Design a protein around this ligand. Structure first.
Ligand SMILES: Cc1nc(N)nc2c1cc(-c1cn[nH]c1)c(=O)n2C1CCCC1
Length: 842
């Protein structure tokens, strides 16, 4: 067909990769996954409610924080319904369903339709109380009034989907290695290390005789392994690595294919290089660059087609191992204890990661026994979903189909609200899967196709990696295509517009970087070029309206060249302001987006996502630490978009303003900046209240994630007291609590005050609230470093969180430690702040 071909070119433009390309492949796994993904796609597409899908209500089943009821001692929530110019308020109960609200409006004024939010593409529909809608909850947290325009429901016909159409020991021959260009260092020797890895664990290791590092190094060696072919587990990788000792290149080949067949034949594998552990080292993908990359020649001539009662102190020994942290290492003694008493271990869902890692995957008998254990699941299936525990089974330590599936089975219970909270880390967890088609990938696909909101972010998260990861672009592309093949023409159209706008704006940011590279000033010659480039695009290129990638509810239209500016950073970022495409928008505020090139925004995406997970933990204990986890999406190679937080200034800009500059910092400026920016002394005290909470929040979050020690330049504050850290792109103070912050808190030097007692109290509640979910945080942290950052210590770097979360210690010793930390920041004052300035000169 020709319309099947024209649509495939549309999918390729959306993906940023061609899924039909067979040039960097040595098997049909990517094709076989494309076919494989049709069934779960169509099933979900066939199962969806067209009314609800088109309207995507963003709802929750979580209670409603104490701290949010205090906004209603009246049991009355006010909603203002709009038509053309007419607007009328309605007295609503928190449990009032939107259905009851429509026949309370039509009743009141008597002498089919849907409630859409003013300015946004969000709707208040379905069988849920208005207290249970995320937008209403935002209006309550922000003191805002619920403006809702009464209009016709969107046509579910717009969301239409276009119809688709042997006991022999294992051995590998290392023929040789070839690189077209060698010139670098001296002439150090080179050998090939062949590892049978499964769940990051090395089952068997075999090296070659060291030979001279030339442009072609032939060995013609058969590497005999101890492992038998029947004993090889599905999901095992032949990990081929090159050492000079030091590691230069790696490549992995899956010993067993997607059709359970044993890999047999001749392979010329183009290898990835290391810079002079992480998710990239696990990839089955080969380096697409055949011209510059190192390759390995290999040959596979391997054929095939494959009660009692626990003692008191042993039960206690087992329970002590099960109680331990995820980062706690297991002894051969602990493993034998977990395994021998596996049926007792099975009774504890929290023992699962330790138990499933305790398995000897290199033994066909043991794996069958493990498969026998998972059949008696019962205690697992009945356990309350523990995402922390579930995510733990989806990391690098688990390379088994069955173990990984039981964890995915647990994620199904999640409401759309919680899926959004973990989506990024769940997509990032696909990197850990041995195979392209997996339960996790099908889970993500299913969930994305069922909710537009999840589907939007799924697109962008998949796109973020397909554009920057040579290691996983193929796999993510195959899943993106699957998603795009069932999301609907409505969404395919919005995505088309978003991609076009972002591609255009990316060009401008790069072109503007050329004009003044690292010299900081921003000449009117550059300001004119940006202004011309913007008006030149607006005229006949940029579409009339695009969906905001970091906030799909907001639709952005026309630019505002007058507010658009290039900025003073060494990397020249674009500050772009837009008119809200929506005519029913209650305000006149623009949509602000910071298009920037320079840093890897993928790390920032991950940091912001944990920040939202900490906010939700805090909600479970009725704490609101007023964080601002701003919109941030990585669009391509070291390029992306940041959300512009309205009425905000940098902490350094405020100190700078009253002159002094050269390391000079006055403790009073922040307080005067707040008083000056607040029209009434109520607005001022509310801002000090906002500062106390936001400050405590960033202090805890920051310290826990190890991104505490920051420059003034990188901490911002709103005109309304709300503090927030920015740019998490890559003496020591645990966090930023400087004398200027402490002065807003009242306190002057080594003293005490009512607002500081409050601040100290909120830190302890917040820190303890985090510690209640130690394992959750430990796993996300670990995952974030493996899938987002460069090279990382499979202990050191990761163990930071454990030490920072003060694992093992009681609630009193933990509170002391955090209050000690606060004092370190007090003692040093401006020491570190001035120290950054000093480093510019010395
Ligand atoms: C969220 C936000 N709001 C405002 N309103 N200005 C910001 C930011 C964030 C960042 C940011 C950069 N990298 N990562 C984040 C930022 O630089 N800014 C400003 C633009 C120039 C300096 C201050």
């Amino acid at each position: 067909s020709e319309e099947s071909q024209a649509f495939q070119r549309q999918l390729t433009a959306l993906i940023g990769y061609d899924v039909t390309d067979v040039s960097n492949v040595h098997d049909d796994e990517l094709e076989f996954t494309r076919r494989g993904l049709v069934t779960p796609r169509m099933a979900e597409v066939a199962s969806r409610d067209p009314k609800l899908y088109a309207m995507h209500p963003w709802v929750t089943s979580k209670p409603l924080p104490e701290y949010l009821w205090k906004k209603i001692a009246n049991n009355c929530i006010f909603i203002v319904i709009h038509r053309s110019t007419t607007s009328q308020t309605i007295k609503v109960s928190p449990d009032d369903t939107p259905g009851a609200i429509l026949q309370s409006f039509f009743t009141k004024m008597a002498k089919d339709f849907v409630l859409r939010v003013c300015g946004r593409d969000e709707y208040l529909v379905g069988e849920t109380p208005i207290k249970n809608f995320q937008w209403v909850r935002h209006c309550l947290k922000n003191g805002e009034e619920i403006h809702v325009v009464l209009d016709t429901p969107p046509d579910p016909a717009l969301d239409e989907v276009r119809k688709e159409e042997c006991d022999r020991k294992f051995r590998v021959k290392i023929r040789g290695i070839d690189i077209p260009v060698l010139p670098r260092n001296t002439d150090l020797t080179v050998f090939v290390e062949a590892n049978i890895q499964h769940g990051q664990q090395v089952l068997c290791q075999r090296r070659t005789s060291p030979k001279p590092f030339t442009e072609e190094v032939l060995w013609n060696v058969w590497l005999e392994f101890s492992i038998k072919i029947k004993d090889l587990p599905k999901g095992a990788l032949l990990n081929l690595q090159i050492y000079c000792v030091q590691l230069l290149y790696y490549v992995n080949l899956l010993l067993i294919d997607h059709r359970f067949l044993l890999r047999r034949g001749e392979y010329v594998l183009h290898m990835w290089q290391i810079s002079g552990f992480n998710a990239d080292k696990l990839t089955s993908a080969t380096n697409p660059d055949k011209e510059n990359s190192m390759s390995i020649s290999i040959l596979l001539d391997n054929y095939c087609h494959p009660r009692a009662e626990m003692p008191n102190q042993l039960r206690k020994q087992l329970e002590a191992i099960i109680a331990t942290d995820p980062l706690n290492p297991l002894t051969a003694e602990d493993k034998e204890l977990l395994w021998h008493f596996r049926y007792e271990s099975l009774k504890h869902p929290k023992a699962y990661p330790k138990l499933f890692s305790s398995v000897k995957w290199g033994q066909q008998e043991i794996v069958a026994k493990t498969y026998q254990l998972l059949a008696r699941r019962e205690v697992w299936d009945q356990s309350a979903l523990d995402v922390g525990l579930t995510m733990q089974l989806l990391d690098c330590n688990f390379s088994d189909e069955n173990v990984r599936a039981i964890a995915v089975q647990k994620l199904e219970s999640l409401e759309d609200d919680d899926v959004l909270h973990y989506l990024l880390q769940l997509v990032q967890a696909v990197k850990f899967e041995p195979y392209h088609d997996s339960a996790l990938a099908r889970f993500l696909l299913k969930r994305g196709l069922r909710n537009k909101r999840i589907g939007h972010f799924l697109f962008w998260f998949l796109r973020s990696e397909i554009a920057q990861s040579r290691h996983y672009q193929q796999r993510f592309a195959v899943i993106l295509e699957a998603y795009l093949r069932g999301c609907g023409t409505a969404m395919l159209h919005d995505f088309t517009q978003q991609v076009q706008v972002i591609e255009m704006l990316q060009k401008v940011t790069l072109d503007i970087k050329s004009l003044s590279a690292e010299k900081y000033d921003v000449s009117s010659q550059v300001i004119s070029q940006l202004k011309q480039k913007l008006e030149n695009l607006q005229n006949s290129q940029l579409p009339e309206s695009f969906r905001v990638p970091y906030d799909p509810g907001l639709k952005a239209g026309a630019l505002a060249i007058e507010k658009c500016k290039v900025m003073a950073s060494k990397k020249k970022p674009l500050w772009l302001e837009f008119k809200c495409a929506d005519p029913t928008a209650l305000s006149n505020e623009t949509i602000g987006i910071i298009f920037k090139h320079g840093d890897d925004l993928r790390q920032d995406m991950l940091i912001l996502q944990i920040l939202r997970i900490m906010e939700s933990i805090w909600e479970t204990e009725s704490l609101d630490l007023c964080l601002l986890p701003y919109g941030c999406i990585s669009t391509g190679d070291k390029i992306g978009m940041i959300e512009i937080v309205k009425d905000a200034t940098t902490i350094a800009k405020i100190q700078q303003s009253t002159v002094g500059n050269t390391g000079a910092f006055k403790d009073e400026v922040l307080n005067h900046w707040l008083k000056e920016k607040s029209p009434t002394e109520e607005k001022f005290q509310a801002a000090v209240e906002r500062f106390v909470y936001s400050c405590a929040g960033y202090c805890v979050a920051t310290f826990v994630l190890g991104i505490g020690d920051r420059h003034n330049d990188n901490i911002m504050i709103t005109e309304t007291g709300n503090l927030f850290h920015i740019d998490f792109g890559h003496e020591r103070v645990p966090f930023v609590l400087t004398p200027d912050f402490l002065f807003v808190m009242g306190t002057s030097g080594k003293k005490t005050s009512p607002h500081f007692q409050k601040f100290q109290d909120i830190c302890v509640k917040a820190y303890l609230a985090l510690r209640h979910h130690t394992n959750l945080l430990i796993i996300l942290f670990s995952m974030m470093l493996m899938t987002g950052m460069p090279q990382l210590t499979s202990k050191e770097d990761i163990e930071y969180i454990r030490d920072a979360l003060t694992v093992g210690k009681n609630e009193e010793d933990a509170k002391k430690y955090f209050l000690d930390q606060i004092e370190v920041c007090r003692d040093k004052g401006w020491t570190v702040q001035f120290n950054w300035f000093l480093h510019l000169v010395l």
